[PDB]
Amino acid sequence: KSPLTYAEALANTIMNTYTVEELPPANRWHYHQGVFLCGVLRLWEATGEKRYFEYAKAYADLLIDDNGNLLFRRDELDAIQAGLILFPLYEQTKDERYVKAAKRLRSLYGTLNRTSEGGFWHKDGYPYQMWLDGLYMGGPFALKYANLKQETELFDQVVLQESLMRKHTKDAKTGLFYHAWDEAKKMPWANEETGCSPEFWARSIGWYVMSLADMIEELPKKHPNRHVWKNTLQDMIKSICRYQDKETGLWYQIVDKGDRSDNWLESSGSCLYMYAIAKGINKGYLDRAYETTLLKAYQGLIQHKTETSEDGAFLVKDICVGTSAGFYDYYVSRERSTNDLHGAGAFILAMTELEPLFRSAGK
Numbered sequence: 001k002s003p004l005t006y007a008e009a010l011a012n013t014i015m016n017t018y019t020v021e022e023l024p025p026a027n028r029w030h031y032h033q034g035v036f037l038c039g040v041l042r043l044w045e046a047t048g049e050k051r052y053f054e055y056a057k058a059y060a061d062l063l064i065d066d067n068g069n070l071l072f073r074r075d076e077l078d079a080i081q082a083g084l085i086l087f088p089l090y091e092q093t094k095d096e097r098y099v100k101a102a103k104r105l106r107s108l109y110g111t112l113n114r115t116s117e118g119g120f121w122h123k124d125g126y127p128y129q130m131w132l133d134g135l136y137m138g139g140p141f142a143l144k145y146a147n148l149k150q151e152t153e154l155f156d157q158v159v160l161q162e163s164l165m166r167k168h169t170k171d172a173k174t175g176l177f178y179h180a181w182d183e184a185k186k187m188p189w190a191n192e193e194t195g196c197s198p199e200f201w202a203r204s205i206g207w208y209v210m211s212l213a214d215m216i217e218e219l220p221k222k223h224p225n226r227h228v229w230k231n232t233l234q235d236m237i238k239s240i241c242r243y244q245d246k247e248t249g250l251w252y253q254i255v256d257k258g259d260r261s262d263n264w265l266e267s268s269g270s271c272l273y274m275y276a277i278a279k280g281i282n283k284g285y286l287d288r289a290y291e292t293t294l295l296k297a298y299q300g301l302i303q304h305k306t307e308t309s310e311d312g313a314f315l316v317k318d319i320c321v322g323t324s325a326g327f328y329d330y331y332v333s334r335e336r337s338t339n340d341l342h343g344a345g346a347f348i349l350a351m352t353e354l355e356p357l358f359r360s361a362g363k
């Protein structure tokens with residue numbers, strides 16, 4: 001069907017599964033709900049259906065009180081991501097509660113611990129460790145804030161975070177990027193010479209390319225990193241696409257090792273690549289010929305990873321559960337779950353960006 005049809009089916013399925021008080025982890029401000037609700041608000045923009053806006057707003061209002069107060073994990077980049085929902089909520093409502101909450105999250109950057117060259121630790125509990133996922137958790141928010149409040153120092157901050165991750169985790173051979181880097185070389189997964197984790201884990205690279213694809217347009221005009229991030233996205237997408245599965249159109253949990261019998265096709269990473277490829281084409285960062293890769297991914301996604309239940313629920317399966325930096329055997333051993341929120345968010349976002357290219361296919 002058309003991308004938005006599946007996006008609405010998944011969103012309504014999950015909205016029917018959980019009240020906002022249940023949306024897991026329940027009564028917590030966290031990126032799982034933040035990425036799902038980014039999706040639902042994108043869907044609201046695409047369709048104009050107010051129920052999508054209202055559900056997102058109700059989660060925000062569950063967690064943020066009359067004075068803008070919010071409880072969250074104060075050492076985690078992960079806590080910052082859900083702040084992305086605050087910008088459309090504020091824009092629609094002008095309710096200063098949302099800007100107040102946003103400023104609480106933005107104020108976190110100055111409190112977090114850092115590697116020697118300034119890269120944020122993923123959490124206090126992960127000292128000297130940068131994980132690719134954190135570019136999505138902390139980067140787009142910062143640039144939205146920068147534009148809302150005209151704080152150019154946040155442009156500089158995201159430029160630095162990204163350059164450090166790319167400097168330390170990009171593999172020149174494949175062009176893929178390792179999941180995490182430990183400057184201290186204290187974790188068991190840290191390579192003794194480079195500090196990197198050993199594998200290309202699909203979702204983490206997915207968050208990175210989604211981030212680049214979304215952040216370029218938030219930079220000032222003529223900002224030097226417009227060129228840099230475009231170039232970076234182009235090469236990353238070329239690298240990723242080389243590993244697309246020829247039979248299903250999808251990508252593997254461990255991107256470069258799809259021949260391994262204990263590897264498997266994973267949905268959230270695949271949807272993130274679809275998002276970044278569609279977004280890149282839509283914005284002109286990527287050659288339009290990537291549309292075939294994209295539509296092939298779309299066909300396999302639906303065919304192999306989705307279904308409707310006897311009771312009518314739309315199900316996206318084989319989404320990796322929450323996963324840390326680690327080894328091959330740990331990654332391929334991760335639980336494969338259905339309709340997990342970060343994967344549902346990636347699915348819904350992918351569909352909204354795919355919709356225009358689907359509509360115009362052939363023209």
Ligand SMILES: CC(=O)N[C@@H]1[C@@H](O[C@@H]2OC(C(=O)O)=C[C@H](O)[C@H]2O)[C@@H](O)[C@@H](CO)O[C@H]1O
Nearest residue numbers: 030031032078123125321322323324325342
């Ligand atoms: C420290 C630890 O491993 N905590 C577990 C959670 O992992 C953290 O949460 C996230 C995330 O997606 O929420 C991913 C990383 O694994 C890590 O930062 C999580 O895996 C959990 C089950 O949801 O169990 C915790 O013990």
